[PDB]
Design a protein around this ligand. Structure first.
Ligand SMILES: Nc1ncnc2c1ncn2[C@@H]1O[C@H](COP(=O)(O)OP(=O)(O)OP(=O)(O)O)[C@@H](O)[C@H]1O
Ligand SMILES: [Mg+2]
Lengths: 53, 53, 45
């Protein structure tokens, strides 16, 4: 059916059969990895508002 | 077909790597010929030989 | 000629490209033929 959005998540992307994730069954794959410098800075700013950068 | 005793049946097979356009072409052909599509799943639980026939 | 150039660039970039990936790539660049013609290299595996 048209007008549908499907979100899929997994921890081991290597385990997904390539036919399950192709451009037309999954239109955008994004990698959510560990923290970076900017991510840690933003988390610190959000958790403790008011402190100097 | 009738004059030669050949059964009036025909079948088609489309094979290829995923994402190349099998199902889309089948839908387009069904639309072009003004036919309907009878989706049948062989690997079902209630499907038997007599029921399939 | 833009279509011919895009086809040649894509075929030079990758060897086996499925129509679904081409459709997705076109989805990325909506109403921007120049961007699609320019950003061929993103299709290389
Ligand atoms: N020749 C083509 N022209 C236009 N779109 C195409 C073509 N081939 C594939 N597509 C696109 O690819 C996507 C899925 O295609 P399709 O379902 O036909 O592929 P498939 O791998 O044969 O399918 P299935 O998994 O059902 O067997 C759709 O977005 C469809 O528009
Ligand atoms: Mg198909």
């Amino acid at each position: 059916t048209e007008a549908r959005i499907v979100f899929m998540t997994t921890n081991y992307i290597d385990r997904l059969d390539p036919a399950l994730i192709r451009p037309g069954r999954v239109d955008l794959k994004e990698y959510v990895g560990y923290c970076s410098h900017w991510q840690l800075t933003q988390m610190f700013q959000r958790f403790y508002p008011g402190q100097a950068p | 077909y009738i004059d030669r005793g050949i059964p009036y049946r025909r079948g088609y097979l489309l094979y290829g790597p995923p994402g190349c356009g099998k199902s889309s072409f089948i839908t387009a052909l069904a639309g072009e010929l003004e036919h309907s599509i009878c989706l049948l799943s062989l690997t079902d639980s209630s499907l038997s030989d007599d029921r399939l026939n | 000629s833009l279509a011919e150039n895009f086809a040649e660039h894509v075929l030079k970039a990758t060897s086996e490209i499925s129509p679904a990936q081409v459709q997705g790539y076109f989805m990325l660049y909506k109403n921007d033929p120049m961007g699609a013609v320019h950003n061929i290299e993103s299709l290389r595996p």
